Amino acid sequence: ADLLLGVNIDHIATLRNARGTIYPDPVQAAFIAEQAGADGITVHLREDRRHITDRDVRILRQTIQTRMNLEMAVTDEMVDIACDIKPHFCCLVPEKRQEVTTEGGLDVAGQVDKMTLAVGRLADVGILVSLFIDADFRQIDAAVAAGAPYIEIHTGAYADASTVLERQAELMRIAKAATYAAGKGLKVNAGHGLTYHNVQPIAALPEMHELNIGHAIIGQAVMTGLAAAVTDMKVLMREARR
Amino acid sequence: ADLLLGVNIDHIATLRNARGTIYPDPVQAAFIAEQAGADGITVHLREDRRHITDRDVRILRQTIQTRMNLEMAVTDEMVDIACDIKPHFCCLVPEKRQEGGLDVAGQVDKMTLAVGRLADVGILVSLFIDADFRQIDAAVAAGAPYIEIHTGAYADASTVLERQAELMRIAKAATYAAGKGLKVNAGHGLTYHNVQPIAALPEMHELNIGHAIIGQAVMTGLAAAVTDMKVLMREARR
Ligand code: PXP
Ligand code: PXP
């Protein structure tokens, strides 16, 4: 019931790729973040490599002193890289139109067989697999039949809610989905759009295992530095579960 | 003696526009930078607004406590905007394939019209150019009181001979331009590791530095990043 913090460092790479320079280097961030209270490091290797690159992935795997979480699209190219690099975690996410739901989560249920097989290959090599899904009982069932030990619930709707009633409903949607996922024996993560100002209610949920969080941290980091930004998110998360 | 630092806060916005968010906000980066030793704030308003927006310029205009330097291409729309906003400086810069530094010599009449309109509403105008004597003269011909010498090639020198050769080209251009009455700025590609030879050149009025500053910032914080860059610049002129 200590909630874990995964720091996603893609946007360090966004800043880098904007020029073709060597800095800022995601590898440096990983060290800052872990020693400031991150429990894991996340990177999304996109097919287009718009931020994180193969160069990044291959070095991070040798330098992450915690657990590495590799977010990737469900493709044969990416399942190969994953089965080579062997991160502690994989998190399967959509990147194409045909793989995503209206809401932004991975369509596990529309492509069950593709999922099961991807999972199978990752697991056979010791990786633990998460599917980033909506707070949806049907997608949850799919992930179980997929054999994915973990899910990550998409906190976007929860983040973007304009009004008090909307926020409440989205929150209850996540709450119920976490309770259900766990019932069916899934370990439950959450992420997308979490900030220094909306994290607590998500943090407070008993079932949440790890929160995955990138942009807000990187965004605070340019002003105050990543060590401060990570510690402050970790503090809010601790306080949320008092 | 004294060397000014203009901090280009463009890539704060690179970070924000990636998502649809409000943070990180260039408005804040400006207070931080100004207060940790920047002497001016530079932003480049692209026609494509891929980083800095009009919202940004509008607010900055009212929040900046030092002086604003607006980087822009030579278009009717951009000159109109800069006539409204009235920054202390304007830096003219290539953006399209038809505009390396600006080709002032190739387009001296256009640059003269543009320099003219900006300077008629009190703007100090700077032309961003290669360290080329010819472009320096075209600048003087167009009326611009400032040049900024492009330091890209220097920053990219991959061999020691290439580096010295780019450094002297910059040194000689600064010397010559100052010998034609220009105020000489420099910029593009300056880091904590290559700034001092440029800082060292007696002619330099202001260094305009962005990316390397934002790049260090996400690690160490904006304030320290700005301050350390300032120190390097002071130490260079000892
Ligand atoms: C599955 C998942 N979780 C978390 C995040 C990070 O969300 P944010 O950057 O909005 O905190 C992302 C974005 O890469 C993601 O794809
Ligand atoms: C005219 C000019 N000067 C200076 C800079 C700063 O260059 P850097 O961000 O590489 O320090 C830029 C980049 O926007 C520029 O366009």
Side-chain angles (χ1 to χ4, degrees), chain B residues 90-131:
Chain B
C90 233
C91 198
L92 302 176
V93 121
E95 260 184 43
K96 309 247 72 194
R97 187 177 270 254
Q98 319 83 53
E99 293 145 7
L102 251 193
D103 180 16
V104 178
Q107 302 172 94
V108 64
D109 293 294
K110 181 162 185 208
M111 289 312 150
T112 298
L113 178 69
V115 166
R117 273 168 75 175
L118 287 170
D120 278 347
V121 304
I123 302 164
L124 285 179
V125 172
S126 194
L127 302 173
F128 180 55
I129 54 179
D130 298 307

Side-chain angles (χ1 to χ4, degrees), chain B residues 113-186:
Chain B
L113 178 69
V115 166
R117 273 168 75 175
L118 287 170
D120 278 347
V121 304
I123 302 164
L124 285 179
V125 172
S126 194
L127 302 173
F128 180 55
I129 54 179
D130 298 307
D132 176 66
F133 285 9
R134 174 210 184 184
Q135 298 277 5
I136 290 163
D137 294 319
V140 171
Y146 288 81
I147 56 159
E148 181 165 336
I149 300 182
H150 187 140
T151 48
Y154 159 81
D156 305 323
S158 337
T159 67
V160 77
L161 264 177
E162 199 160 15
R163 177 167 311 105
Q164 270 156 33
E166 306 307 336
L167 187 60
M168 83 147 222
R169 228 171 69 86
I170 287 162
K172 285 157 131 70
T175 298
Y176 175 76
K180 307 291 277 152
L182 290 169
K183 276 144 163 55
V184 57
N185 290 338

Side-chain angles (χ1 to χ4, degrees), chain A residues 18-166:
Chain A
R19 299 280 179 82
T21 60
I22 184 179
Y23 55 80
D25 194 337
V27 184
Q28 186 184 8
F31 285 116
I32 313 312
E34 296 179 313
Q35 293 169 25
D39 307 291
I41 301 302
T42 299
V43 278
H44 189 177
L45 187 61
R46 299 173 193 273
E47 197 196 322
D48 56 31
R49 277 76 188 173
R50 75 169 81 169
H51 45 56
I52 291 299
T53 59
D54 312 285
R55 170 277 190 200
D56 298 325
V57 172
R58 153 165 57 70
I59 285 167
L60 283 157
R61 177 59 179 96
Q62 301 172 262
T63 77
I64 278 154
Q65 310 190 154
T66 60
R67 298 115 84 256
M68 179 180 188
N69 175 26
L70 173 56
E71 290 170 6
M72 50 190 222
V74 192
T75 73
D76 299 340
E77 151 177 64
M78 287 291 161
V79 181
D80 290 346
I81 294 152
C83 291
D84 176 29
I85 284 172
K86 273 165 254 104
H88 195 103
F89 288 106
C90 267
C91 182
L92 271 31
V93 307
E95 275 172 45
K96 252 102 197 192
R97 272 157 136 215
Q98 314 290 345
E99 52 211 36
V100 72
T101 67
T102 306
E103 187 188 342
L106 173 66
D107 186 6
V108 179
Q111 34 188 27
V112 214
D113 306 288
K114 196 214 261 181
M115 297 310 176
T116 304
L117 285 176
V119 175
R121 284 182 75 199
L122 297 165
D124 291 6
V125 127
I127 298 156
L128 306 141
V129 176
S130 186
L131 325 168
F132 182 54
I133 59 168
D134 301 319
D136 176 301
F137 287 170
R138 195 205 157 229
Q139 295 288 2
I140 278 146
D141 281 345
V144 176
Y150 274 76
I151 60 158
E152 190 186 308
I153 292 163
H154 178 14
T155 55
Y158 163 77
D160 294 342
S162 30
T163 102
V164 164
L165 180 157
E166 231 189 303

Side-chain angles (χ1 to χ4, degrees), chain A residues 19 21 23, chain B residues 6-8 10-11 42-44 46 51 69 71-72 91-94 127-129 148-151 186-191 207-214:
Chain A
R19 299 280 179 82
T21 60
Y23 55 80
Chain B
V7 177
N8 174 319
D10 284 348
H11 293 119
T42 302
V43 285
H44 184 177
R46 304 184 68 81
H51 45 53
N69 171 37
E71 281 180 9
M72 59 178 247
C91 198
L92 302 176
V93 121
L127 302 173
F128 180 55
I129 54 179
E148 181 165 336
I149 300 182
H150 187 140
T151 48
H188 203 263
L190 307 164
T191 67
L207 306 184
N208 291 314
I209 316 165
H211 200 241
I213 297 184
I214 319 313

Side-chain angles (χ1 to χ4, degrees), chain A residues 11-12 14-16 18-19 21 23-26 28-29 32 192-195 215-216 218-227, chain B residues 11-12 14-16 18-19 21 23-26 28-29 32 188-191 211-212 214-223:
Chain A
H11 290 328
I12 298 285
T14 299
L15 197 43
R16 186 190 55 210
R19 299 280 179 82
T21 60
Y23 55 80
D25 194 337
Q28 186 184 8
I32 313 312
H192 215 287
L194 297 172
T195 76
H215 199 246
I218 308 319
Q220 189 55 62
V222 268
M223 308 292 170
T224 57
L226 194 53
Chain B
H11 293 119
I12 305 283
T14 307
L15 260 159
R16 167 200 67 185
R19 288 297 166 79
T21 56
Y23 52 81
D25 191 336
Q28 182 198 358
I32 290 155
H188 203 263
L190 307 164
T191 67
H211 200 241
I214 319 313
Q216 164 99 273
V218 301
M219 303 302 173
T220 66
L222 195 49

